[PDB]
Design a protein around this nucleic acid. Sequence first.
RNA 1: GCUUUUAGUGGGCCAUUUUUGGUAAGCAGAACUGGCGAUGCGGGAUGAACCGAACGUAGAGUUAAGGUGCCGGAAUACACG
RNA 2: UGAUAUGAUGCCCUGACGAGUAGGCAGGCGUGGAGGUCAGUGACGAAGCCUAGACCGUAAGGUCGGGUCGAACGGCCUCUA
RNA 3: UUGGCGGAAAGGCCUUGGGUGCUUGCUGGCGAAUUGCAAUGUCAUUUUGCGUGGGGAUAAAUCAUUUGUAUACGACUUAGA
Lengths: 183, 127, 197, 156, 106, 48
Amino acid sequence: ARYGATSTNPAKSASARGSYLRVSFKNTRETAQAINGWELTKAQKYLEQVLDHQRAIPFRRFNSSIGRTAQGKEFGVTKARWPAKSVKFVQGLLQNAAANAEAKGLDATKLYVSHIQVNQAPKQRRRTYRAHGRINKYESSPSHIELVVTEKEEAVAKAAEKKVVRLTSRQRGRIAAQKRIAA
Amino acid sequence: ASLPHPKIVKKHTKKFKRHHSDRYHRVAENWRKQKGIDSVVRRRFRGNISQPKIGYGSNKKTKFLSPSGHKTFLVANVKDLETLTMHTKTYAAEIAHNISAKNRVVILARAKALGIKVTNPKGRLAL
Amino acid sequence: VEPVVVIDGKGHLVGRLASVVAKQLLNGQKIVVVRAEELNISGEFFRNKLKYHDFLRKATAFNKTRGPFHFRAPSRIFYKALRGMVSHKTARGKAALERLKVFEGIPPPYDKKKRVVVPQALRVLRLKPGRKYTTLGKLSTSVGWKYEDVVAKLEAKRKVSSAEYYAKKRAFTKKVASANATAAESDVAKQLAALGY
Amino acid sequence: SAQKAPKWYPSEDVAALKKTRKAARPQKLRASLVPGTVLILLAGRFRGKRVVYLKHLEDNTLLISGPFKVNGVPLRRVNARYVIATSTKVSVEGVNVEKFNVEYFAKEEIKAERVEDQKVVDKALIAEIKKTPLLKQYLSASFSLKNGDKPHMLKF
Amino acid sequence: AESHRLYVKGKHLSYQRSKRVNNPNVSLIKIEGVATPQDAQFYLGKRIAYVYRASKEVRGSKIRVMWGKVTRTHGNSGVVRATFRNNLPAKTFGASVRIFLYPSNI
Amino acid sequence: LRSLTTVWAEHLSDEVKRRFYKNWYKSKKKAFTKYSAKYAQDGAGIER
RNA sequence: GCUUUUAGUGGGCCAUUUUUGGUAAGCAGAACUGGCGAUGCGGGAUGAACCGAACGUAGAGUUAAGGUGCCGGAAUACACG
RNA sequence: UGAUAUGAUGCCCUGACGAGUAGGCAGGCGUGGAGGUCAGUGACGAAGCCUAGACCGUAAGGUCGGGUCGAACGGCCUCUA
RNA sequence: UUGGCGGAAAGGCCUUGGGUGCUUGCUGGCGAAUUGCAAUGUCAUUUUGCGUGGGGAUAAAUCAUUUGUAUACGACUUAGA
């Protein structure tokens, strides 16, 4: 347990995790934010279309000097990519969350991904050998991914606070004076 | 429940924060005087932050009083509370941060027997 | 007094009118200036044309499209003269400049409203008679404003329609003064004259 | 010990007040407030109403008669600073206004004696109003500053 | 009647300021119809209300008031000075203000 | 110069109609269909 | 009135007036005083030295130098050219 | 200084003053440890940590609430670095 | 409702006819209070949303494919029931 900030029903959810995963954190963050909020079937078709170069992943935050493409035009962006490694890892965690929702007794037709977050894992180090006898770093930047799918539910209806009003003597003397004049 | 005291005037409700306490994380907000030769804060240029000096000293009639008009006295047990038996209009008790909730129920019960004010009566309540 | 003040710009001096309209904008009065093509500037035409060319050479040397923009129309000459007198880079100054509408000629709605003048900016009340002046329309045309002839056509059309309007209105107030002439010498008229009315 | 003690304690005896020298003298009204003057109420529920003034009460108010039969204002109190004293005067000598005091308006629907005193004063007030032309209409109308009216040049 | 106004219209001009330092405690009010400081002497001490609106109803009303008074004249041209309970918030530079006369020594 | 009015003809060819389309084959081909109704009633609004 | 003890300092600079060398210099060097350094505030748009005035925290009033067409608080004041 | 009520380093009356580098001096705030004390706090939760939550002090800082946590730690009078 | 004028940003102005409402032009009758001696004592228009009920009309664009009159990539230019 101990997931991110969830505002969802824990009884009507399912969850999946992946830790210390050797993929790019930045690509995986862009695929996790391209998917956050969708119906799980829509998310799966979208990721399998991204793998087939039919749609793209809109790179919004980690997007400097990325090339341009037309496939970001459905998202209102010009820079978008197809991060296949992160896409296969994210759809693997989606498969695991769908299995967990089937095991918890949740109806697979209302599953939307309600919370997906990804943060940085401990880096894996290697050396790079540069000119004039120097050594720099060559570090993988892995990622912890986690996601909570949730049953969507209906109306968010009333019976809330009632705001007991407190108004002065000149002010309630005005209120009765209107109901005395007119109806 | 307190004495008749004058209107409490503070003369500076704003906390004197350090210069560039917001600019860096290393520079804490706890006040330190600027010692620089070129500092506009030490030189008191206009538009810069105000510095603590003795003119902001609170009134000697209304210094150390809470807004209720009592001086806060820290209390660890029933014995330290009972020093404020004959001093209810000047001093108010505050139960300390480490007094356990099986002891504070005794301390608040003795405080209402002597009528002593407690300024934190909701601490560690098992409601 | 009025919610929106329409100022007839004809016969007015640019800086004095721009000063009073700048203060009226900043104090909260909505101003529309019409007939901007008939403004005046004191001093002969060649002087103010030389002044416009001195303004016309000031531009950013590395990219002139970010430079001072030399708006040529009489409304926008007047607007630059006014925008210099308002702190235009603040939210208060931008709010004041939203309370201003400047037109050359008199377009719709403001050609059926009452126009005012500002006597601390009238050239006939400020300049000494004999001091030479410049009309803003010929100056703007000389520096590259393209629409003097169209404004002339549309203003002649508006003058014909307004002349017919005033002929009808003057006949109507002739009937009104005739009917008010019979109302005198009765009781209530002499009592009104007793009460100053 | 979480705190030690103060070595001295303040005395919990409340000190008595000094003898003050601020005597209460009766209020001198401005010279435009003479009983029988038509006032303009500047504030409250009956703002803008033209209302006859009857008595200067002991609590520095003014007792007024915004004639029900004329404009609907009862026997009422007003503050003298919230009142324009105009220059139109009704003679008030036939009014039994000697009764009403500060205790009469004690708050503590309408008491029937207040209804009766209103009609009793209203009789003599209507009798003195109807002697002059257009005073009843002037009293039935409300006041409002029209466009261009500058109150500092206007004489009321 | 179609007119109900019992106050004099006015404009919140600015704070009391020098060239480069203002003072938000004192405001300058341009009263409509006042051209001299001798006409402005009538309005000294009259109570000033700035009336504004909100989205949130507080105590039955959606209209809030900041109350103040006229203190002294200003200049040679009928601008007057005014102090308030809470100072006027300087987005209202050029906003309309009600200057009453309910303590009208008249 | 400001365009105030633009009048068209009753029948436009597919060469012309095809100019107002980015995907002509997918369309229901609805261009100027309601506009030809102005020529339907006797040519009144067109001459107006 | 008197005494002891000790810190920092021992690169200075500007302004009025006097004044030397130099064609002069935001130059080099003197004399007297006042400043800056060490000093914020109002003015001179802006500026170490100029003008005004030196500073605990605040309120009211009055001014200094400087200003009052608009930016900008305050006369598109009055008078003779 | 006269007790039978508690600060004579006190309390109270009065007047004037308050810029500041280098620098001097004074009164305090905080930390590690030591002696004494409060027969002090504490597994019914010590210390720590987080907290556009509250209170006191001109300030150094002190206090309280809530969360987290699990074994020790503070107030006062002095000593010491 | 009759007709007319207005394209500068017309989106407004003038006119015909009857209906319905008010009339303070003049004279009356009744009502008002208690909001307590002031508290803006709430009367404007600005946008959006939702069910209700009455008319009305039933599309395109992008990606993918394609061309090269275009082209680093986007973009552009074509074509495809």
